[PDB]
Ligand binder design. Structure first.
Ligand SMILES: C[C@@H]1C[C@H]2[C@@H]3CCC4=CC(=O)C=C[C@]4(C)[C@@]3(F)[C@@H](O)C[C@]2(C)[C@@]1(O)C(=O)CO
Ligand SMILES: CCCCCCCCCCCCCC(=O)O
Length: 581
């Protein structure tokens, strides 16, 4: 109470306290060296130990924001590396942290970590605390809004992988599959949390509560409304704190919520038992990623209370938010086969009916057939997910990505090529993950992951706005975000980008790139072909990229690579224009 840092240190323990502060500094200061950050963590850990022993000691009565924010401004390489970030230090709290958070880089362009099993299993023994410590540093700086306590968990997933594989003869065959899967889990985790932080920023905590009521109601249909409301309230406060960089307060409140859920597990979900017999980080993660519980047999029809009841306006008038919260809980728990956006869309439609009906002469007659408005809202995304999986299953991942790059480049040609390539590549991998699932699990998978990919586009677009359409879709409404983007079409009055030959000129440098980086260069060229020829068919673009593809493979196989590229390049560049007419 007297000393907050004393409280956090005592509650969290040294390793996790240090760990979260290393992650904290790594997110705020993303280009600072590892060894520099290690000292800053030690200097804070040092001071926290003094306060826990004697809370009356100087500076111990200050808030963690102040104490952390003060330590950030004493960084010697602050003005040199980060520039404008040093201007924030002149401002006072709470405006100083708000200033720091804006200067977090969502796209830091950092070296793509190669999994080198010979180098790392050896480095795991050379300096182990440096190893697991550096892993936290590297993930944190590439993902400045990554869920702090969730990153500590991934570091222990990292630890366990090396201790299991390094002993074995073939270190590569064991480690690579395990590490490859972890990179996929980290990108998804980063994406999930960024949408929580984005929702706070753009739509406030009411939007974050609504989303969570829907998701946890699906996860815990056995749980009553007062439990879901309690868990949502506590969990919203947790994500608010983490998203504002208060990782220590975030981590402590998260541990309290883990304890609560597990002390009341029988009346929340039968699927939590395994989770609650685990250490804090394993327990917390297991709760967050818990599979949905079996549906209760004893639930009545919704219409009885939400269409038929004659005192619905009375319920609505006195307690607007609570009664809508009640509707979302009841609709969500029955429909785990629905996306969270679809549930929030339905709930927004219900509110809209009551605002208009309780004003009219005969309200009961008005909101009698409110459930008829939902059937078309359900069918639209069902139709979209079918067409995309039908396309994916036919043409496979790479060609599905290319089809989506063309789709989104036409929707927004003003958006930077790297941004368009990223969402096309992301949404293609969603095809791989989601389409191989049963129909009931497929819609939520696709549309939930789509929301994460659209948020990424909105985050990158917010930093550097180019389109008013994209701004409107990104800022209007979170529930209506997917519909808004789905509706986007090629601007009739779009001025084609003028032809630059250098943009479509390849060299021998491409041959030495890893396959992923090789595809990005070709997929970057595809986006540019669309920007130059926006009225070209997807089938014309598929063919021209196939020629570029064949041209690269040929010259990268040639005895004289640079000689091949010099001769063949301009010929293909010239014919490609005529082909896209
Ligand atoms: C869970 C409840 C119910 C929520 C509402 C459910 C219906 C709805 C759907 C939307 O697409 C946008 C806003 C609303 C209309 C809503 F999401 C927000 O207003 C926030 C809300 C009241 C809530 O989140 C609270 O804040 C409760 O106090
Ligand atoms: C509106 C987005 C719907 C689908 C998102 C599913 C993936 C999980 C991300 C969690 C982010 C929650 C968003 C929020 O805080 O409102």
């Amino acid at each position: 109470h007297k000393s907050e840092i004393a409280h956090r240190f005592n509650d969290l323990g040294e390793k996790h306290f240090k760990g979260l502060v290393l992650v904290a500094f790594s997110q705020y200061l993303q280009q600072c060296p590892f060894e520099d950050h290690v000292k800053l963590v030690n200097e804070v850990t040092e001071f926290a130990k003094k306060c826990a022993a004697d809370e009356s000691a100087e500076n111990c009565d200050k808030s963690l924001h102040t104490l952390f924010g003060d330590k950030l401004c004493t960084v010697a390489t602050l003005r040199a590396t980060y520039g404008e970030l040093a201007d924030c230090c002149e401002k006072q709290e709470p405006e100083r942290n708000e200033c720091f958070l804006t200067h977090k880089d969502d796209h830091p362009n950092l070296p793509k970590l190669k999994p080198e099993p010979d180098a790392q299993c050896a480095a795991f023994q050379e300096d182990p605390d440096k190893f697991l410590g550096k892993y936290l540093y590297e993930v944190a700086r590439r993902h400045p809004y990554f869920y702090g306590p969730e990153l500590l968990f991934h570091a222990e997933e990292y630890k366990a992988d090396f201790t299991e594989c390094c002993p074995a003869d073939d270190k590569l065959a064991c480690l690579i599959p395990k590490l490859d899967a972890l990179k996929e889990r980290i990108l998804l985790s980063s994406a999930k949390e960024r949408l929580k932080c984005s929702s706070f920023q753009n739509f406030g905590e009411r939007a974050v509560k609504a989303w969570s009521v829907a998701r946890l109601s699906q996860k815990f249909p056995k749980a009553d409304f007062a439990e879901v409301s309690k868990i949502v309230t506590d969990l919203t406060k947790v994500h608010k704190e983490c998203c504002h960089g208060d990782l220590l307060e975030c981590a402590d409140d998260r541990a309290d919520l883990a304890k609560y859920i597990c002390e009341h597990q029988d009346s929340i979900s039968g699927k939590l038992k395994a989770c609650c017999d685990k250490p804090l980080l394993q327990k917390s993660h297991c709760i967050a990623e818990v599979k949905e519980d079996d549906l209760p047999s004893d639930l009545p029809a919704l219409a009885a209370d939400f269409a038929e009841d004659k005192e619905i306006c009375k319920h609505y008038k006195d307690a607007k938010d609570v009664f809508l919260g009640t509707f979302l809980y009841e609709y969500s728990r029955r429909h785990p086969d629905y996306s969270v956006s679809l549930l929030l869309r339905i709930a927004k439609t219900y509110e809209a009916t009551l605002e208009k009906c309780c004003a009219e002469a005969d309200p009961p007659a008005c909101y009698r057939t409110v459930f008829d408005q939902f059937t078309p809202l359900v069918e639209e995304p069902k139709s979209l997910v079918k067409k995309n999986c039908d396309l994916f299953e036919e043409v496979g991942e790479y060609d599905f990505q290319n089809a989506l790059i063309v789709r989104y480049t036409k929707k927004a040609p003003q958006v930077s090529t790297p941004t368009l390539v990223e969402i096309g590549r992301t949404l293609g991998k969603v095809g791989s993950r989601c389409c191989k699932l049963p129909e009931s699990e497929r819609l939520p998978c696709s549309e939930n992951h789509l929301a994460l990919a659209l948020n990424r586009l909105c985050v990158l677009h917010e930093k550097t706005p180019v389109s008013e359409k994209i701004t409107k879709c990104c800022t209007d409404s979170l529930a209506e975000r997917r519909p808004c983007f789905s509706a986007l079409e090629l601007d009739e009055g779009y001025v084609p980008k003028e032809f630059k030959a250098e943009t479509f000129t390849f060299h021998a440098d491409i041959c030495t790139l890893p396959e992923d980086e090789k595809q990005i260069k070709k997929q970057s060229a595809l986006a540019e072909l669309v920007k130059h020829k926006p009225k070209a068919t997807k089938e014309q673009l598929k063919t021209v990229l196939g020629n570029f593809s064949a041209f690269v493979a040929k010259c990268c196989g040639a005895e004289d690579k640079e000689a091949c590229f010099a001769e063949e390049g301009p010929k293909l560049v010239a014919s490609s224009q005529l082909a896209l007419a």
